[PDB]
Write a sequence for this structure.
């Protein structure tokens, strides 16, 4: 399957191509996407994105994983998380979300198996 393009991003709102649902935060992978909800993992801005947050993207099979860490990058990303993805042979991009969605879609556009997790507020 193909990584869907992210169709729109604005404050606290995201749309994935071929999704029925307007998300706030989301996970996106080859073949689909889901709402990202910190309550499922107990993720806060600190210590931030956990392996548990990205696990379900990893297990879909991606070469590259983009983390959109928010509009002003207030959401931290522990290095143990990034190293977790690297052990799994994944190219990781950590960026402010606008720049994340932009990178993500360029990877989609060059037919890379790309996934990601995006935070659309602070």
């Amino acid at each position: 399957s193909t990584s869907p393009e992210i169709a729109s991003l604005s404050w606290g709102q995201m749309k994935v191509k071929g999704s029925n649902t307007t998300y706030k935060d989301c996970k996106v992978w080859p073949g689909g996407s889901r709402t990202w909800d910190w309550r499922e993992t107990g993720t806060e801005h600190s210590p931030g994105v956990q392996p548990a947050d990205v696990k379900e993207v990893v297990e879909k099979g991606v070469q590259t994983l983009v983390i959109g860490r928010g509009m002003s990058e207030a959401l931290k990303v522990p290095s143990s998380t990034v190293e977790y993805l690297k052990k799994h042979g994944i190219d990781v991009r950590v960026l402010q979300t606008e720049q994340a969605v932009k990178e993500y879609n360029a990877l989609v556009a060059q037919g890379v198996r790309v996934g990601g997790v995006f935070h659309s507020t602070c």
The helical segments are 38-41, 51-58, 79-87, 97-109.
